[PDB]
Structure 1
């Protein structure tokens, strides 16, 4: 016996050779993408042999085995229906009506704080899925770049905990939501910002990453880090949005100066420089496809699902997902933690970085904000998602009424 031939016969279906197109649509139907980095040796040796013998698209038992030999384990799990969502193509059908039912929520106002987020169309709306096994799906404006704005706050918090540890990082920032009037206090009773998901806490966290080095290297360090979270998909930077947050952030200068007064940074901090490094991290660009892999990295204990690389410590991922649970959606956070129960994080460009732990990561994006600062279609979509599947933090995996469980068979 051998898994290469075991896999060979499962696609061969009693015939003696496999057309390679029949193999890739079998592959593409599992939800994997042929561009997947863990499939690259196999696609290399398929493209080589559809050159080697350009006659017959067809593959004998060793022509198949020489091609899938080096990734065979991940193709067995794909074809033996062992991915976390086994019937991925029903799931994407469901994603599609969830996307298309959120698509007709009219309302919201595009953030017009700066000329750069007024430049985005209200009818843009994209959602991208990446599961803990690399299965992907997108619908809508998923390859359109936009800035994370404060979707970067969990990502930089995780990096800070990864290099520094929870105890150090939480000498300087709290771990609870403020209370839903204190939309306007900077510090809790211990003179620490309430948590890493508010501006005062984010600014303090930004002050802890890669100390002792200038703002050019730190930005690279976070970008090197954000690159691996996305399995090297698109992570960019829009200098346009940086310059306009550069002279329209009197609040962050207010927070920055208030924090310097009450001695909330580590010794030797250049506060004004930390604000610029902060403003830059907010102008970093992604698409929903790029970002959903970042989200799935958090869904997968800190391992990038499409590379197998250890990006974040499990301690870092854990803290980041518990604070996104409770403080991730501005004033809607408690309502969100009750009704949706998923770690999510919103940003003013229209992003919602969503994580369904142990299953998948997501990014939803539509620029029209509601009156608390959260993308309207994102909020609607994430409600309909939990109303349809047992993904809520406190749904039961055995008795879940008439919800769906994409993790299961029939």
Structure 2
């Protein structure tokens, strides 16, 4: 325990929250109406310790889509059900250079955090059963990770993502061409499942619980239940540490030093190993595609509380 008095730590979270709030830069994603809708002023931070202690400030109950924030989670599920060796016969274990190919030196997506990786990972989960069944499987899993808190679905986002993801289809066919999917995979059906997963909704509060589960070696801080295998958690964290922030991953690993994962909805799934889970959210993104207020908050948190991986 680095937070001796949670109650006082909470007071610092609010101060940091207020500080980041003053950062108004960035543009709200608008490649689809469902994301343009959001007000740039929404800003919420939710903490959930390994204990089970909670704390929120800002718009922490407004539902938003996980988007790329779901990548770490579905990867954790795959490693959990199939183990490191199998999962990684299809996807890499490290950051790529940056233009921006699809496959690496072995015709495998560089890692589970980039789109091609997430797509392949999606094709490994619950093979055999139909999409509908696969979807409930993952939903059930996400609920355990969130200790049964809010986990919804945005059909509007799903539909917009599907009838607009031309690049995800390009990736889909390319991977199919390079034989990157398991024998007998319905490629188009996987892209569909992929769009659905990106459309799952959460709130800063429910997500913080999911982060805390990863922060707690796979045990839900608020139910005590074992959701993910130790193996799965460690893998997910390692990859979030190196590829969770898009093109900002390097800077983030160097300056913040914490496993995190951003999403185009403006969310940032943050994890402080053996301490707490967190979810920052604010629609305005920067050139890198990360939440402006979120990035700011993270830097402040590590400076103030010295949570950096190497202190």
Alignment TM class, shorter chain as reference:
over 0.9
What RMSD, in angstroms, separates the aligned Cα atoms of the two structures?
Answer: 0.7
The equivalent residue for 1:217 is 133
State the distance in 2 between where 1:216 and 1:106 align. 40
Report the Cα offset of residue 390 of structure 1.
1.8
Q: 2:113 aligns with which of 183, 197, 202?
A: 197
Larger Rg: 1 or 2? Answer: 1
Q: 1:118 aligns with which of 9, 20, 36?
A: 36
The equivalent residue for 1:392 is 308
Structure 1: segments with no counterpart, 5+ residues: 1-83, 395-410
The equivalent residue for 1:405 is none
The equivalent residue for 1:188 is 104
State the distance in 2 between where 1:356 and 1:179 align. 27
CA deviations over 1:40-95 (Å, ceiling 9, x no partner): xxxxxxxxxxxxxxxxxxxxxxxxxxxxxxxxxxxxxxxxxxxx633111101000
> What is the count of residue pairs matched by the alignment?
309
Report the Cα offset of residue 185 of structure 1.
1.0
Report the Cα offset of residue 357 of structure 1.
0.3
| SS at structure 2 position matched to 1:171 | coil
State the distance in 1 between where 2:13 and 2:206 align. 18
Is 1:108–2:108 an aligned residue pair?
no
State the distance in 2 between where 1:116 and 1:135 align. 33
TM-score normalised by length of structure 1: 0.75
Which 10-residue stretch deviates more, 329-338 or 84-93?
Answer: 84-93
The equivalent residue for 2:194 is 278
The equivalent residue for 2:254 is 338
CA deviations over 1:150-189 (Å, ceiling 9, x no partner): 1000000000000000000000000000013xx6211010
State the distance in 2 between where 1:85 and 1:236 align. 32
TM-score normalised by length of structure 2: 0.99
Report the Cα offset of residue 362 of structure 1.
0.1
Higher relative contact order, chain-length normalized (CA < 8 Å, sep 6+): 2
Report the Cα offset of residue 146 of structure 1.
0.2
| SS at structure 1 position matched to 2:183 | coil
| SS at structure 2 position matched to 1:362 | strand
State the distance in 2 between where 1:173 and 1:341 align. 24
State the distance in 2 between where 1:219 and 1:392 align. 36
The equivalent residue for 2:280 is 364
| SS at structure 2 position matched to 1:117 | helix
Report the Cα offset of residue 106 of structure 1.
1.2
